[PDB]
Amino acid sequence: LYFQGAMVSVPVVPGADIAAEYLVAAEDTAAGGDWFDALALGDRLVLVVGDVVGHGVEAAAVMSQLRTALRMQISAGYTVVEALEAVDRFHKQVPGSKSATMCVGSLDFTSGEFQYCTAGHPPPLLVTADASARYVEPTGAGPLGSGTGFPVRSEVLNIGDAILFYTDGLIERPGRPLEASTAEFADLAASIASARPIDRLCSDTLELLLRSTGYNDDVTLLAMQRRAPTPPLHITLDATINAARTVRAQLREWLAEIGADHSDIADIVHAISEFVENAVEHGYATDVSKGIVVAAALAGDGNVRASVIDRGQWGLAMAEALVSEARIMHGAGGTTATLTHRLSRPARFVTDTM
Ligand SMILES: [Mn+2]
Ligand SMILES: [Mn+2]
Question: Where does Mn(2+) 2 bind?
């Protein structure tokens, strides 16, 4: 979810929790030379952090183009390497884009394989399940317009393992030398690791690191922890007056496990509750036993898809106005009401200590 091509929010997926927090060096401006991105592409999750030189009203403009450029290639299904190379060739047409740096990674949901490239960009922190932090190795890539190419490495992340993409603003803090400030970020991430766990890992790291020391560049932190997927939801109920109350309760449990934001929860629970109520009241089978089937699942593209199937009734404008997409189908002996809703959690935009 974007506002003006800018990511104001992070997606939600079965096999990873993602959080994002950022600060902008300037005053009264929504963006600088930094950006982050997280694209849920089905069989994988692609993470992006980037830094454009000299922020800078001019630096935002450059960032905006690069972001749109990288997103277009990634979402068209090119690999990390191919995408980065498309962008590097594109930079010629984007003045000020030379020496922009990026860190891009792709998580395979099945294997935990996380293929990443550090294009002249400080390397990701890995916080493991047993609260060991350590930096992943730099891939050997350099920034845009460096002719270094874009070589890529891999790390296997287990369930509970997290990884932290960040910009140099996080570790180049006022009155702090690089190797000390690097080692403090790592230790603190370790410390905090012994909401969702990735939220506080992301939130608390950044706010203690900057608590006293302040900041002087753009700062962007994009964290994701691998998790075991919540199984899909399935309920088979009697077409009774309490059916909706039953479904709502369980749908709430489920969406909490999934890790959805309250707005998405409110939307989706509203839609499905109304489908169930409509099924009950409208409502023409005199056999009410197991007359209602509800199913809901989160896919790796960040959409929840749900269906309410009943034994036929004598919801569109309602549901179409609440969730990304809704549909109703009728046949003899049945009605199916469906919804598809994209999940998002907002990024945290902070302004504290200069
Ligand atoms: Mn910059
Ligand atoms: Mn910077």
Answer: 51-52
Resolution of the experimental model in angstroms, please? 2.6
**Distance, CA of 45 to chain centre:** 8
Ligand 1 centroid from CA 295, angstroms? 46
Q: Is 267 helix (H, G, I), strand (E, B) or coil?
A: helix
Q: How far apart, in Å, are the Cα atoms of 192 and each of 122, 186, 201, 208, 347?
A: 22, 10, 6, 10, 20
Q: What is the pairing mode between strands 44-51 and 325-331? A: unpaired
Q: What is the CA radius of gyration of the chain?
A: 23
Amino acid letter, 150: F
Q: From 3.40.50.300, 3.40.1180.10, 3.60.40.10, 3.30.1160.10, which CATH number describes the 9-227 domain?
A: 3.60.40.10
Contact between residue 232 and residue 294 where contact means Cβ atoms under 8 Å apart:
no
> What is the Å distance from ligand 1's center to 184 Cα?
22
Peptide bond preceding 312 in cis form (omega within 30 of 0): no
What's the gap in Å between 108 CA and the centre of ligand 1? Answer: 30
- Closest C-alpha to 345, from 267, 271, 263, 269: 263
